């Protein structure tokens, strides 16, 4: 699963986590097994306007 989120919301991508994005956008199971990879993309996903 791949997507782009805000910098402060990466901590919400984790099992048993509550927040604006975990509740309404993307929810992880409590028995989740696997890996989470996240890196900054301020070079491609930023525009002056």
């Amino acid at each position: 699963d791949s997507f782009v989120i805000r910098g402060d919301e990466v901590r919400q991508i984790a099992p048993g986590q509550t927040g604006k994005i975990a509740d309404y956008n993307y929810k992880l199971p409590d028995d989740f097994t696997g890996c989470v990879i996240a890196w900054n993309s301020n070079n491609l996903d930023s525009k002056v306007g």
Binding site: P15, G16, Q17, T18, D30
Partner: protein
């Protein structure tokens, strides 16, 4: 006091049952002694702990 032998059995049984029932009012290291309090105040990851 002639019937102490028969009274002792009843006394020990009542004491054992009372102790078992009263054992429900201990934290055992948890925050609260009633699980309803825990399940209505904390998120699952440490509520389950």
């Amino acid at each position: 006091s002639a019937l102490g032998k028969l009274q002792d059995v009843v006394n020990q049984n009542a004491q054992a049952l009372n102790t078992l029932v009263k054992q429900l009012s201990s934290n055992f290291g948890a925050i609260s002694s009633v699980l309803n309090d825990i399940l209505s105040r904390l998120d699952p990851p440490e509520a389950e702990v």
